[PDB]
RNA sequence: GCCAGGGUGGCAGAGGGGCUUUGCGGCGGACUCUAGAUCCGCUUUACCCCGGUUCGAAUCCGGGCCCUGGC
């Protein structure tokens, strides 16, 4: 609570220590779900893929290369210009852009369309045989709220969504029509186009890079490839070039991601767009790899490719100077960096059920169901703790005054009792805490047997009694509304959280299960709380 | 050059300043093409699209949303699952994936489609976590999309960047969608916000939740467009229909805000034509600074010997004063030997009445607003000299080196005398200076011009025996 | 080299692959010191302290806290205003600012002091906003501080970096201080947290709020220290006493969390000695990779002519096969003319019984774990060749160039014959190869070693007439 | 791509022309119980896609994918 700067200052100026110990008045008395870890801050988290893409950008920029956006969708004519003959071999592993035509409301489906009851479903409205032609002319998506909500009456799409379904079975015959447009397999396809417009107008050497998407087709399998991937690519345009330049770049580039040693082999493919005997395969050794559940135990992994563009394809775009091209594949580099083994599990994790809450996050989700509402009750429970926490080994029966005060304007006095005998006031597991560990919620007592759980897991700080106390603290305040005179709340054995006042939102509950987690909250809690609210 | 600690150490004990000035000895002597600005470092430069994208990731992260990558290639059955009965209207604007049939030609379209907007993949991604993770769920993703809207190039393009995000809680107003827009949009300058319900009323958005955010950015007021009032529609958002969520088993509602990147990118870096922005390499838009054009202007033939340098260095040293004396009139500038034989340098305007050096001996080359000029430093050209990048290379300077290296060719050719002369200056070659053939095709492309003209009228005779 | 679009364009119309292979013609021919890895790009590298600092700024920003710069130089009257009666105990560990008195010698201390911790400046900064801005106020700042703790160097230093933050609300528990620690600390790997009340009970923190955060980081378990259990005290925090706030007019409480940077920096990049981290330039810690040492190993004298290259290039081409034939025995390798006169190259071991080339003609130079070795590629050295960076320069290779350039000196010296010979290899000069004098002082400093020894036993005679 | 054994419900794992395991777990209900057990009730009658044979196939034949003992 806010205090008075003056007062606290004119009192401390004379008597300090007295003002000090007084500070405690400004703190806040938090209820039960107002304490750590029941309260916390949240922060956003990046995705390994996008992360690496960023690192990758900087990396490049840090070595001279300037950023650029290349043509993604291109006419396969370009590919056939970059492979001459071996072109087809590629276009098989590429994707073509197909697209739905328009409802041919003429000729073929027109003659036989004019030999039946043109229209029965009363709609009238002058022959809009032109408002339908402007469709076979040039329409789109946001154009339906024109030939309905402004044509045959009826708001937006309340009748337009079915008028085009019942009276127009036509639409349900459209079929996407392939074309010559393609989704570039690799970056290179677009480089020729872009380098085309500037290979000789800007000063040499030219250093350009671009980390963007590319689409490929390789045995429709999420495992053995993905339809789309990222390719951190670059091009080096200069008068004189050698495969060395390809290495020098590959080095300086990888070196900013750990890799400490590189080896370059000559690629067998010997692709057409690259000069003969320049398509190199670059291998880099990175520590994080040494000895792993992978095939790169020795640390070495092939991380990129590169070569010089054949003065052939270059001419196909009238590029006079030779050009170096390195092509780091992102997804891998990301796995190595962020430690993932399965491409698909890394990039698309939510889908592969790779979600996970932490011990601490689960502990934070375990709230207290029945919790007081009046400053009094907060003390009633706080107190029920004292007497029940101390007089735990009292050969029952036996009452014990816990609280003495006025609640809501009525004399209140609650006691901690026990009915049976030959036992103790409170059961043995009265001081059992809820510790989350290895993903399972537990209701155990501190021991030399449970250590592993209190030093590795994360304790919730709530003990059965601490949980119950709050339940009782509620009942008593209830009677303070029903103006009764005697409430004796009692709890026997514990089988779950419910039998402890604790609970967790349904979603965290489902998580636990989905994750093969386990909740274990049982034990003799036994401890009734007879109240005498006059 | 590497000096000696001790030597200089002790040398400083006697007379300090005599040793201090002694320091100038370690400084390297620079040739003409070795000093600023004919030498300079370089560095990468990011693209405004991408920059804005990263700038958007942080923005999102800064308001709590964690990143995720959504499906890009999808079976249209999804668009259908979401839009309900409006699904077909949409499938029009979307692309489809077609492949070539293996000839054991003509692409065979398939059921796959490139997402027309993030929302297509959202339902798919939220399907696996919506009821397993603790609420609220705040996810976002800035990735590529594919629309066919008229299949245009001018107005819009085939692929854009969506700056999407989704909020999954038990209770959601249209307000959460309002807050998220301001928090996100404010981190870019936008000061005032206005929302208007969208007429499109897309069927995947609970009826009457779909809104359109209008933001005010002072960077716009006065703009050469209809965004002068400062406001611009910058993003849309709505709340997913239970009809669609149900289709994927999402029990709780979901707020979805979408940000049109290329637009923001434009607002930020101030481009008018998206294409001229996202794709300037093609749309002729390419620039070099005057400072850059400058650096590229270099001395062609330059003295290849230690002496050669101190030769032309003198040639000028005299013209810088005797470029007056009524011609004819001869002056001596150098006295020494190179390679093996003694040498002397002469400078005179053999011709009749006039001055020794032409009226352009003191013309400096400077680049300005894209053109390469050859002009005298007169109180008339000031602005060219105070807004451009003066090469530092003057007519006589450009000339000298030519001679100082030309006599150097006779000195090794056994010859005894050479008469290097120079009258007018039709261009640069005439002033002994060049620019890589590429900056040249550049100047022209950027329809700039080179005006290096001038009556140098200066000849140099040298005798080596 | 720049080719001709058309030429190659048409050339491809006839036989494609014949034109494709024709492409290899544009590739530049590289000299010995021009190819990898004797040529490579470089790039800046940030310091772990700073990195961590930036990494901390974002972390803070990511949990909502806005940045601010606090006063650094201050009148001790503040330390006093805050610590109440304990104020002097503190003033001990703090520094004071002293200046020189203008002689119209002996510094004159003053009342100014360099802050011992952020908190000193916090009260000052919060003084102006605590009651004017809307709550909650969340500020943070990662700046420099000055402590005198024993005035040591080993254990601690004179200046450290505090990663402070303050939370100003009407109601604050010790909990807010707990949450902020986890949110902040988690973004670095810390998984489990443990807090323990601090005994120090500093008087500026409400009695019994001052805590000490203990965080668990898997990156530690197994560490060669007492942080093996994985946990480490990583930060402290408390809630400002009304006694202190009052002194500055702050009505509402304030939570303050402090993060010891140099420590975090260490945990992250794994340094053990703070000084060896923050100040490695001094503490001898400086490294070069084998790949770097490599690049620095270059051919000293190399063929300065087009032919020269194809000469040594042949010299080796023969030794690569005739390094067997029982000596004496002579072979011819080159046939052509350079500069003006025809030339032929001879290779023979004039001496009696043995082989032509010594047993070290095929020794490649490789760098490994810091040493520069000269070794044969035998199934015995593998690991050196598969964990190090092989120069690619072999004994004969290193040699050749020497000769191919040595006959080049006779070819221009008018001479008629030269006999370049070579027996043992006591080091690199002997193999015609060098390393900048600085990498040399390096190898030694990093007490590494160079073992380039070997019986080359190969001589080359050449006759030009 | 090549010989052969196989691709069964939340998990494990026998059989297998149509009726058909079982154990573990969870789900719901009940218990005089001071300790982490007790009993009763329970799913989506589970066995990949397209064809063939049959009255009918998860159980029989071919093609497409998935794990291998192997090249």
């Amino acid at each position: 609570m806010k205090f008075d700067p003056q007062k606290y200052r004119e009192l401390a100026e004379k008597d300090f220590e007295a003002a000090w110990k007084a500070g405690k008045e400004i703190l806040a008395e938090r209820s039960p779900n107002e304490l750590y870890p029941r309260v916390g801050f949240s922060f956003g988290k990046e995705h390994p893929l996008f992360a690496t893409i960023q690192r990758l950008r900087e990396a490049y920029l840090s070595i001279g290369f300037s950023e650029v956006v290349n043509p993604l969708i291109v006419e396969d004519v370009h590919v056939k210009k970059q492979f001459g003959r071996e072109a087809l071999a590629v276009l098989d592993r590429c994707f073509y852009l197909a697209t739905l035509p328009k409802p041919n409301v003429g000729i073929s489906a027109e003659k036989i369309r004019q030999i039946e009851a043109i229209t029965k479903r009363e709609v009238d409205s002058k022959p809009l045989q032109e408002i339908f032609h402007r469709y076979k002319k040039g329409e789109i998506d946001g154009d339906d709220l024109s030939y309905l909500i402004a044509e045959v009456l009826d708001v937006d799409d309340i009748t337009a969504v079915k008028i085009l379904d019942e009276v127009f079975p036509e639409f349900k015959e459209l079929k996407p029509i392939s074309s010559t447009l393609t989704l570039r397999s690799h970056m290179t396809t677009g480089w020729f186009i872009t380098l085309s417009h500037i290979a000789d107008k800007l000063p040499l050497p030219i250093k350009l890079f671009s980390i963007d998407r590319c689409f490929r087709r390789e045995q429709g399998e999420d495992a053995t490839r993905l339809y789309t991937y990222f390719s951190a690519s670059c091009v080096l345009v200069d008068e004189e070039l050698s495969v060395d330049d390809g290495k020098a770049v590959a080095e300086a580039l990888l070196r900013q991601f750990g890799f400490e040693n590189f080896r370059f082999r000559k690629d067998e493919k010997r692709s057409k767009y690259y000069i003969p005997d320049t398509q190199t395969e670059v291998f880099a050794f990175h520590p994080k790899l040494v000895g792993s559940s992978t095939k790169y135990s020795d640390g070495w992994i092939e991380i990129a490719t590169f070569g010089i563009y054949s003065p052939t394809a270059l001419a196909e775009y009238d590029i006079p100077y030779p050009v170096m091209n390195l092509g780091l594949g992102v997804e891998r580099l990301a796995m190595i960096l962020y430690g993932y083994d399965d491409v698909r599990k890394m990039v698309y994790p939510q889908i592969h059920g790779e979600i996970k809450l932490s011990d601490l996050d689960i502990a934070r989700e375990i709230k207290v169901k029945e919790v007081p509402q009046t400053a009094v009750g907060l003390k009633i429970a706080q107190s029920i703790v004292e007497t029940a926490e101390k007089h735990a080994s009292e050969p029952s029966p036996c009452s014990f005054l816990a609280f003495e005060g006025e609640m809501m304007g009525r004399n209140v006095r609650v006691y901690v009792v026990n009915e049976n005998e030959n036992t103790k006031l409170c059961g043995p597991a009265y001081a059992n805490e809820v510790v989350v560990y290895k993903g399972d919620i537990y209701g155990i007592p501190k021991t030399k047997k449970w250590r592993s759980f209190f030093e590795e897991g994360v304790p919730t700080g709530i003990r059965y009694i601490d949980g119950f106390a709050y339940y009782a603290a509620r009942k008593v305040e209830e009677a303070a509304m029903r103006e009764q005179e005697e409430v004796k709340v009692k709890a026997r054995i514990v089988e779950n959280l419910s039998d402890i006042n604790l609970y967790i939102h349904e979603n965290v509950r489902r998580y636990i299960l989905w994750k093969k987690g386990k909740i274990d909250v049982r034990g003799p809690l036994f401890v009734t709380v007879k109240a005498e609210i006059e």
Side-chain angles (χ1 to χ4, degrees), chain A:
Chain A
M1 37 175 270
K2 61 171 302 183
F3 59 61
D4 188 351
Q6 206 186 313
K7 240 69 170 196
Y8 253 99
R9 178 183 43 192
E10 57 193 10
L11 160 65
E13 205 284 353
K14 312 295 183 186
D15 183 2
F16 183 11
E17 294 293 299
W20 199 63
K21 170 177 159 292
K24 289 180 167 295
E25 67 181 56
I26 69 168
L27 303 182
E29 290 185 302
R30 302 309 202 184
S31 75
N33 305 317
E34 273 175 52
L35 285 57
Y36 181 95
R38 208 147 300 102
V39 287
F41 277 75
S42 54
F43 54 102
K45 185 138 59 294
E46 307 180 9
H47 174 69
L49 223 215
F50 289 133
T52 316
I53 310 286
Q54 178 57 44
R55 319 251 264 86
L56 235 25
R57 304 184 56 208
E58 296 164 51
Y60 272 123
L61 293 122
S62 294
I63 71 177
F65 297 52
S66 314
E67 210 173 25
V68 111
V69 178
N70 291 313
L72 204 169
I73 299 176
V74 295
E75 281 281 1
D76 50 2
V77 329
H78 291 290
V79 177
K80 295 171 184 170
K81 289 176 51 56
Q82 286 143 49
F83 290 81
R85 295 64 178 64
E86 185 173 293
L88 293 179
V90 177
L91 291 75
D92 288 297
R93 69 173 186 176
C94 295
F95 288 79
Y96 285 83
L97 280 45
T99 171
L100 297 186
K102 296 298 174 299
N104 186 187
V105 294
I107 306 303
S108 182
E110 188 186 7
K111 172 185 173 63
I112 190 176
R113 174 187 175 183
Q114 303 176 61
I115 193 176
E116 292 180 58
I118 300 296
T119 301
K120 281 300 303 299
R121 173 66 197 81
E122 169 56 2
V123 296
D124 291 355
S125 296
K126 304 180 183 300
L128 59 169
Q129 198 61 56
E130 289 300 303
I131 286 65
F132 264 117
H133 189 178
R134 293 297 177 295
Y135 202 122
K136 295 296 298 298
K137 195 92 299 178
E139 285 283 57
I140 49 178
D141 64 300
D143 58 1
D144 191 305
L145 304 307
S146 179
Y147 45 59
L148 193 293
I149 189 175
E151 179 69 3
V152 296
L153 284 56
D154 295 358
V155 291
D156 59 302
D157 309 299
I158 63 171
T159 59
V161 300
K162 50 214 304 177
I163 186 176
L164 304 173
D165 287 48
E166 56 179 357
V167 183
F168 296 65
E170 164 63 301
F171 304 176
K172 310 308 303 300
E173 176 62 294
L174 303 183
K175 312 167 189 174
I177 308 170
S178 309
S179 66
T180 39
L181 282 187
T182 55
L183 293 174
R184 59 173 182 184
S185 65
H186 63 201
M187 193 65 59
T188 294
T189 284
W191 280 123
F192 289 107
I193 285 170
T194 287
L195 274 168
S196 169
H197 303 63
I198 58 96
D200 46 49
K201 314 177 194 311
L202 299 157
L204 261 45
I206 299 182
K207 293 171 171 53
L208 308 172
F209 84 85
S210 176
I211 329 291
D212 202 35
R213 272 168 178 296
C214 293
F215 308 57
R216 197 104 70 180
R217 169 176 170 275
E218 286 291 347
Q219 299 297 301
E221 305 165 2
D222 191 1
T224 313
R225 259 62 181 180
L226 304 176
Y227 295 156
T228 308
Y229 73 107
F230 283 80
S231 186
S233 178
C234 67
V235 293
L236 201 186
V237 168
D238 200 349
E239 317 204 74
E240 291 297 9
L241 289 177
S242 69
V243 146
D244 298 84
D245 285 352
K247 299 171 186 170
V249 165
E251 189 201 88
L253 184 64
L254 279 315
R255 276 248 227 156
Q256 300 185 56
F257 298 81
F259 309 87
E260 307 163 306
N261 196 180
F262 315 93
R263 292 282 190 284
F264 312 79
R265 85 180 177 197
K266 295 295 157 296
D267 192 355
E268 296 199 302
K269 288 195 183 68
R270 292 180 80 66
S271 298
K272 307 308 172 183
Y273 58 99
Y274 279 137
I275 266 177
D277 186 60
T278 45
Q279 172 153 57
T280 284
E281 278 186 293
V282 47
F283 287 92
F285 163 90
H286 186 59
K288 286 190 50 47
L289 292 175
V290 298
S292 180
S293 177
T294 186
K295 193 68 176 181
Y296 323 98
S297 297
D298 48 358
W300 295 84
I301 190 291
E302 176 196 2
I303 202 173
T305 313
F306 80 69
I308 287 70
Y309 280 140
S310 172
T312 286
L314 257 40
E316 274 292 63
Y317 291 76
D318 197 277
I319 293 180
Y321 301 94
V323 46
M324 191 280 127
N325 159 193
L326 187 303
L328 196 294
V330 181
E331 296 76 3
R332 179 158 299 177
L333 210 191
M335 306 196 285
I336 287 184
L337 302 181
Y338 290 60
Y340 286 83
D341 276 349
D342 182 3
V343 173
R344 317 124 43 188
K345 274 190 173 185
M346 177 245 248
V347 53
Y348 298 99
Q350 293 70 16
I351 280 175
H352 295 201
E354 282 297 352
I355 76 175
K356 167 169 193 302
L357 295 181
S358 58
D359 290 326
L360 181 53
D361 266 299
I362 291 174
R364 180 184 305 291
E365 286 296 331
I366 300 179
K367 277 52 176 47
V368 175
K369 184 78 73 174
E370 302 283 0
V371 162
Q373 218 65 51
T374 300
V376 190
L378 235 297
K379 290 189 179 62
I380 278 59
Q382 207 76 182
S383 68
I384 303 179
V385 182
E386 276 59 298
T387 67
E389 186 178 301
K390 304 175 183 179
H391 304 297
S393 301
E394 303 291 303
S396 58
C398 64
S399 177
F400 279 114
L401 172 53
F403 179 80
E404 173 69 3
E406 184 186 7
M407 178 208 289
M408 301 178 89
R410 298 160 68 67
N411 249 298
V412 179
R413 52 187 174 75
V414 187
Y415 311 124
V416 177
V417 303
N418 187 297
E419 318 299 59
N420 306 300
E421 303 192 62
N422 193 183
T423 186
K424 307 172 189 61
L425 183 53
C426 298
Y430 75 116
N432 277 51
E433 191 170 53
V434 187
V435 290
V436 184
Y437 166 88
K438 275 298 189 304
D440 330 298
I441 300 191
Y442 280 123
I444 62 181
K446 291 215 76 301
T447 313
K448 294 61 66 181
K449 173 186 184 299
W450 283 144
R451 281 189 182 181
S452 54
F453 291 54
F454 288 77
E455 298 185 302
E456 293 185 359
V458 347
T460 187
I462 323 302
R463 296 175 299 173
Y464 295 5
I465 55 176
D466 295 305
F468 178 107
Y470 288 113
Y471 189 0
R474 179 58 178 175
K475 309 294 80 176
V476 299
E477 282 184 354
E478 291 185 355
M481 301 183 283
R482 297 196 301 291
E483 267 66 5
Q484 197 213 306
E485 40 75 297
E486 185 183 64
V487 189
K488 303 178 180 180
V489 56
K490 52 191 64 180
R492 290 172 171 54
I493 36 68
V494 177
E495 303 299 359
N496 54 202
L497 301 164
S498 177
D499 310 313
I500 253 317
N501 214 332
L502 268 31
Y503 84 89
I504 59 177
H505 190 300
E506 74 185 73
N507 264 56
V508 302
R509 194 138 225 155
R510 289 205 275 292
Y511 167 71
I512 302 287
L513 270 298
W514 152 272
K515 270 289 180 176
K516 299 175 176 183
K518 55 186 178 180
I519 305 305
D520 186 310
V521 176
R522 292 163 299 189
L525 187 263
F526 297 65
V527 55
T528 304
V529 176
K530 297 183 179 182
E532 296 298 302
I533 54 288
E534 298 184 358

